[PDB]
Ligand binder design. Structure first.
Ligand code: GSP
Ligand code: FOK
Ligand code: MG
Lengths: 330, 437
């Protein structure tokens, strides 16, 4: 029954949402440390905000001098990795978040590296002050954690067995992927879309999306993975939509071919720019696929949002039909 | 005609089955009668025990007597080695320089490896007694664990075993205390507690990982077997081994004058190896290694390198000789091209994978003695001073760069005169080797 187990793996750059998509799929159908992770994600988010408040090359003003004491407090607790969760510091962080300077720094967070969930996590401070509420499914899927070792997850659907292979995206872990390049039914490629504007934290020069696209070119053209027909799940679509609707940043900041690009004919409340952005990233992946196509691997782009559920289930149903087709070796 | 064909086919099959045990040769022969990866014949095995040997005084005897007599004594000692080993349910894996290792119960489960330990003690005392009639002392390293067995490459396949346990055994033998065994806990817990053993080594090896040293159908079958012969052993040696005079003449040898030797190594592979729970037991790592070696062999067969003959592969180390078959110094140019092509091949497989691998290359020139050292198992081999000179030039080299002996050519430029490495025989300052220009 080796074939009957549809084993498939996700490959992509760091913070592309693969672990989140695994968690969302798991809760869609098949603790104290989790709450700790919520708190720690909040801590690092606010820490990075206030560190880049001053470390940023263009200085940003502070709303009120009275919060300079809290800024010094957070600077003192910056180098400290101790797991401190005092209500006083929660009140301090609440005071900072209502300052216009901190909000402006968050809006200017595109210059440095910051976790994506921060904003949402920055609205959970009032209820995380109590530290007693049970986290919701949205809260669980908003949690941020790193993945280094490759992970396998059981799966069952329509009375058949699937296997999830979630691997790391950091360059240090890119050597481990060959450990699972064999006998895999399909590849579920996941690339963070809204992270087009970010850059990698491994080098601090190259864009996260550019690095992801180069990794996709490597994976698709790999001389050992030529009969597996990768399936594309571009995550991060909701943040991409809100970012383009914001208007502060656009794809032309990094890819003027988008400015030359025009909307395709396969368009599906909406706006032209967001639709053509998602379609353009899909079309760039498809261009890399077809230009390196060999007649055996086929790319089926499908737009995904990990935090969403209806989108998750719809795209997962489409992909499950695709995997059911490919299983028979048509 | 049918009887004659059956007899000759049986003889040829037995010549193969001298090496390459049944459980893998069956899979190969099944594959010949009719893939995202190059395919590999490794199977996991448990409850295996690894012995090791190494002449500690080979540097104290290689210089004294010539290569021919040294080969004579090495052949007689290794013939005793192999016979006494086959007496005690032990099968040689390979012979490399002076090293010699065997496993316990690989084709089928078996234990009681201490019998082979006392057997090794008796054999070693016999060898030293024969030699006295020069320091030829040797160290015993035995470790128990689980291994992966199989063959790699598309030319000169040999039975080989890879694991972390065999690495521990290699380190145990490399420890020292000649004439005494390394009987680390993995063997004490397995064998028994009634055996009298000491406290173990004080400190000789690097304190790392805490080793705790304490008619048409018959014709088709004949064609398949002939193909496998041609893919295992050299043509003339295979012809000599097919007919009589396999055992009547113990040593088959010949000395050659204008010979070159090349060694290449991949030090970083020990980095990439990892025996976790997801990748079965590192089988994917050995798949990558088999891909590398297959690329090297596929590069070998091309028309641009005809006078170079692959001999053996020690781990990720490639040994290739030149001048053995005379049919001028263009063959050393061919060896240099071989090294350059190997470097480009490993860089290509670097870029195809997602890690970094580098090659250490050492070339030497001189006169060698080439022959077969094992009558029961056909293992073509080389010996001589230049052999260990090349081995040291490879081991005492810098990764990603090619080291060269005294310059005897000018076609493609070299660089790096100021090395003056101490070596092991004497100090010798000779340049290094880059590409064509
Ligand atoms: N708002 C929003 N947040 C998302 C979305 N997708 C993922 N996230 C959040 O982004 C974070 C990063 O996801 P994660 O799964 O950790 O990336 P990763 O690729 O596994 O990280 P790595 O191991 O490669 S470094 C998660 O905490 C998740 O909550 C999304 O579509 N919308
Ligand atoms: C590829 C396998 C791996 C990682 C582990 C292993 O068992 C080895 O193959 C042995 C020990 C093993 O094959 C026994 C022979 C010999 C020649 C001692 C090998 C080399 O030491 C290899 O190291 C090299 C690369 O020289 C090494 C150690 O590398
Ligand atoms: Mg992850």
């Amino acid at each position: 029954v080796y074939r009957a187990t549809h084993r498939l793996l996700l490959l992509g750059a760091g913070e592309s949402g693969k672990s989140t998509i695994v968690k969302q799929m798991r809760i869609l159908h098949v603790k104290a440390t989790k709450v700790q992770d919520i708190k720690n994600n909040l801590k690092e988010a606010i820490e990075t905000i206030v560190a880049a408040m001053s470390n940023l090359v263009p200085p940003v003003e502070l709303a009120n001098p009275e919060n300079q004491f809290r800024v010094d407090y957070i600077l003192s607790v910056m180098n400290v990795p101790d797991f401190d969760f005092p209500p006083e510091f929660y009140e301090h962080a609440k005071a900072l978040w209502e300052d216009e300077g901190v909000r402006a720094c968050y809006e200017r967070s595109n210059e440095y590296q910051l976790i994506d969930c921060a904003q949402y996590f920055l609205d959970k401070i009032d209820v995380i002050k109590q530290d007693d509420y049970v986290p919701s499914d949205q809260d669980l899927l908003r949690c941020r954690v790193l993945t280094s070792g490759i992970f396998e997850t059981k799966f069952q659907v329509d009375k058949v067995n699937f296997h999830m292979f979630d691997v790391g995206g950091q360059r240090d872990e890119r050597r481990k992927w060959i450990q699972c390049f064999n006998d895999v039914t399909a590849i579920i490629f996941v690339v963070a879309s809204s992270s087009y504007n970010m850059v990698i934290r491994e080098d601090n020069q190259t864009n996260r999306l550019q690095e992801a696209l180069n990794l996709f070119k490597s994976i698709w053209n790999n001389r050992w993975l030529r009969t597996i027909s990768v399936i594309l799940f571009l995550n991060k679509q909701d943040l991409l939509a809100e970012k383009v609707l914001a208007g502060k940043s656009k794809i032309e900041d990094y890819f003027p071919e988008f400015a030359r690009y025009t909307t395709p004919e396969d368009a599906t409340g909406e706006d032209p720019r967001v639709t053509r952005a998602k379609y353009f990233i899909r079309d760039e992946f498809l261009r890399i696929s077809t230009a390196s196509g060999d007649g055996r691997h086929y790319c089926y782009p499908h737009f995904t949002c990990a935090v969403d559920t209806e989108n998750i289930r719809r795209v997962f149903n489409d992909c499950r039909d695709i995997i059911q087709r490919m299983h028979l070796r048509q | 005609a049918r009887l004659r064909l059956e007899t000759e086919n049986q003889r040829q099959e037995r010549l193969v089955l001298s090496v390459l045990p049944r459980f893998v040769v069956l899979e190969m022969i099944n594959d010949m009668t009719n893939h995202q990866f190059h395919r590999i014949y490794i199977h996991r095995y448990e409850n295996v025990s690894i012995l090791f040997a190494d002449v500690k005084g080979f540097t104290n005897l290689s210089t004294t007597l010539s290569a021919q007599e040294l080969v004579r004594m090495l052949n007689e000692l290794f013939a005793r080695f192999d016979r006494l080993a086959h007496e005690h349910h032990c099968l040689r894996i390979k012979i490399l320089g002076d090293c010699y290792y065997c496993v316990s119960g690989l084709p089928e489960p078996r234990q009681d490896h201490a019998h082979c330990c006392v057997e090794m003690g008796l054999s070693m005392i016999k060898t030293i007694r024969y030699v006295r009639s020069h320091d030829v002392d040797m160290r015993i390293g035995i470790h128990s664990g689980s291994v992966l067995c199989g063959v790699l490459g598309l030319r000169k396949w040999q039975f080989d075993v890879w694991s972390w346990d065999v690495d521990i055994a290699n380190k145990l033998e490399s420890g020292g205390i000649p004439g005494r065994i390394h009987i680390s806990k993995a063997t004490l817990d397995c064998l028994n507690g009634d055996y009298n053993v000491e406290e173990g080594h004080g400190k000789e090896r690097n304190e790392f990982l805490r080793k705790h040293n304490i008619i048409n159908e018959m014709k088709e079958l004949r064609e398949h077997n002939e193909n496998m012969l041609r893919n295992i052993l050299p043509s003339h040696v295979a012809r000599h081994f097919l007919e009589k005079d396999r055992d009547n003449e113990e040593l088959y040898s010949q000395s050659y004058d204008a010979v070159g030797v090349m060694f290449a190594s991949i030090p970083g592979f020990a980095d990439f190896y990892s025996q976790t729970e997801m990748n079965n037991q590192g089988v994917e790592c050995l798949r990558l290694l088999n891909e590398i070696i297959a690329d090297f062999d596929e590069l070998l067969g091309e028309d641009r390198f005809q006078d170079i003959e692959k001999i053996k592969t020690i781990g990720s180390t490639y040994m290739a000789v030149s001048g053995l078959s005379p049919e001028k110094w263009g063959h050393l140019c061919a060896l240099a091209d071989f090294s350059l092509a190997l470097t480009e091949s490993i860089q290509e497989i670097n870029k195809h994978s997602f890690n970094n691998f580098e090659l250490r290359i050492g070339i030497s020139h001189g006169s060698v003695v080439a022959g077969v050292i094992g009558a029961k198992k056909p293992q073509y081999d080389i010996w001589g001073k230049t052999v260990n000179l090349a081995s040291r030039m490879d081991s005492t080299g810098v990764s990603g760069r090619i080291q060269v002996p005294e310059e005897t050519y000018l076609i493609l430029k070299d660089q790096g005169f100021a090395f003056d490495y101490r070596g092991e025989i004497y100090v010798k300052g000779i340049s290094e080797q880059e590409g064509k220009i």
